Amino acid sequence: MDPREVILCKDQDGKIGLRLKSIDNGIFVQLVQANSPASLVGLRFGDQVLQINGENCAGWSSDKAHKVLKQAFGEKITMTIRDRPFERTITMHKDSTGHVGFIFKNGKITSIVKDSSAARNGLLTEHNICEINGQNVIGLKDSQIADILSTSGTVVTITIMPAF
Amino acid sequence: NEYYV
CATH class of the missing domain: 2.30.42.10 (PDZ domain)
Structure with missing residues (x-):
């Protein structure tokens, strides 16, 4: 604080x-x-x-x-x-398909998928992704972020911030 | 490109 x-x-x-x-x-x-x-x-x-x-x-x-x-x-x-x-933390669970339920581009969340864990957890769009399970993703390419999310186990814990 | 995840 x-x-x-x-x-x-x-x-x-x-x-x-x-x-x-x-x-x-x-x-x-x-x-x-x-x-x-x-x-x-x-x-x-x-x-x-x-x-x-x-x-x-x-x-x-x-x-x-x-x-x-x-x-x-x-x-x-x-x-x-x-x-x-401005940072917040959201924890999500991958479903059967291995998805938490959002679309991203250039480190910003752009869409929430219907009735996914991202939806249940009130993930917001127009928010940058800072960390995923301890790993900082600022300054990385979208592919490296998608690969971090892939080899992730079920619990996916992201910190986000409003783009502002 | 985008990435549904």
């Missing part, structure tokens, strides 16, 4: 491996480069950034957010973070 603090190191160009987005007058993590300092401190897609070096992010554009990181003084950048405020 509460915000955690993270401390990251810059590279030479002053980067941490992070793209940010403006949403409802907050700032959110949109992309996290592999093997970056951002990645190492556990920042993910959907995390809200409340502060960068004690300075409030409220009302900032993403262009302003990035500028503040690039021009930050010293070797360490501190951020105050709220872990994915």
